[PDB]
Structure 1
Amino acid sequence: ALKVRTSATFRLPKTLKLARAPKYASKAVPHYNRLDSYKVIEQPITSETAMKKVEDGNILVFQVSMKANKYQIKKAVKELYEVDVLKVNTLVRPNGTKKAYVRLTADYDALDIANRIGYI
């Protein structure tokens, strides 16, 4: 009888650690996707100086969820409007909304797609 410890330190024995196999579920029904596409992008912005960005910079301008992000915004734009996207800049306007400058790739003309959506 004995056993050899070559360390004078006793450690907490590594032990099972099961897995939660509940019995009754947390929620009843998993929340639907908060922040989907119609929610990411809320509105075009159509002040005259944004309009110039459409006419001259291949840029679509949107008020966009405060909760969005350059990924989430690009995706929604890419799908609601069937267009490809070069980069998104964003800022938080001083009235507390987020505006997104979305430049389209050169395969697209924002002005075209601007007045497809139906503003000018």
Structure 2
Amino acid sequence: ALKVRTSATFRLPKTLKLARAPKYASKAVPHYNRLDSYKVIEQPITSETAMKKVEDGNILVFQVSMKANKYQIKKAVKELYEVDVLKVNTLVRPNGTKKAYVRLTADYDALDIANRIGYI
């Protein structure tokens, strides 16, 4: 006989699909981490306005890579300086660089970390 077709519409049948098994690698050498901790954090900002936040607001001011987001900045600060971060605010400066306001938790002081780095 013939197959019973309750629908008058014919549709493309589902066929097996195989995954790729290349004979050679696409590049054969993976690229290293494009944004590691030393690239996310470029250098601290040491203007007079930024120094007041360090003393008063318990906030460290950094210049960061334009490609880094808030997740990467928080992770980099913890690994580079062994501190805890409460929150991160970022902005793009008129000269084309990114500035991050990093506020530490109450268990840490921004003043003693700042002079441990070397800037004041």
**Distance in 2, Cα, partners of 1:115 & 1:94:** 28
Shift of 1:28: 1.9
**Distance in 2, Cα, partners of 1:56 & 1:23:** 61
**Distance in 2, Cα, partners of 1:22 & 1:73:** 37
TM-score of the superposed pair, with normalisation by structure 1: 0.99
Q: In percent, how many aligned pairs have the same letter?
A: 100
**Distance in 2, Cα, partners of 1:85 & 1:70:** 11
**Distance in 2, Cα, partners of 1:117 & 1:51:** 14
**Distance in 2, Cα, partners of 1:6 & 1:27:** 51
Give ranges in structure 1 of 5+ residues lacking alignment: none
RMSD of aligned residue pairs (Cα, Å): 0.5
**Distance in 1, Cα, partners of 2:57 & 2:79:** 21
TM-score of the superposed pair, with normalisation by structure 2: 0.99
User: How many residue pairs were aligned?
Assistant: 120
**Distance in 2, Cα, partners of 1:25 & 1:5:** 47
4+ aligned runs moved over 2 Å, structure 1: none
**Distance in 1, Cα, partners of 2:16 & 2:23:** 20
Shift of 1:33: 0.5
Shift of 1:51: 0.3
